[PDB]
Design a protein around this ligand. Structure first.
Ligand SMILES: [Co+2]
Ligand SMILES: [Co+2]
Lengths: 93, 93
């Protein structure tokens, strides 16, 4: 059904078989997209939106910064951090 | 519906109207039970297990240590920390 981008990333992150494109790395919440192109592609497939690429995926994450769901780590690139404040709220109907 | 203990605490944590019994405090994932007795009571009601109390609630959480869902902050009391490793896995069917 209707799965959301943040949920998709935790799905990918939940299995180290996906490490070639995405993996936890760092302290609580921190991950890196080892292949952002591949992560965008897989999302596009899942949400049957085959116009999806990395630029569009990066834009959609921007929405999540103001919701406190996650935040981009400035300085590093392709690095991000899930925040429990917003995730706990996003987890609610 | 049938809801899980870790799921229940995130629900409570999602709303600061519950601060009198449970609140985020600290860095990513860190929380403390301002009223552990109240938290156990509300759980018992939710899972229709009216034998529930703090001692049993703290037992149930110990299960989550080896699942990496959460950990107890040693040296403090009633302080805990949700881990995104285990949570990402717990969200999976
Ligand atoms: Co936060
Ligand atoms: Co961890």
């Amino acid at each position: 059904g209707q799965i959301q981008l943040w949920q998709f990333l935790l799905e990918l992150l939940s299995d180290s078989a996906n490490a070639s494109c995405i993996t936890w790395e760092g302290t609580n919440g921190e991950f890196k997209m080892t292949d952002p192109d591949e992560v965008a592609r897989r999302w596009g497939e899942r949400k049957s939106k085959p116009n999806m690429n990395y630029d569009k995926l990066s834009r959609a994450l921007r929405y999540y910064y103001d919701k406190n769901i996650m935040t981009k780590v400035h300085g590093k690139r392709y690095a991000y951090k899930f925040d429990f404040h917003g995730i706990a709220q996003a987890l609610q109907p």
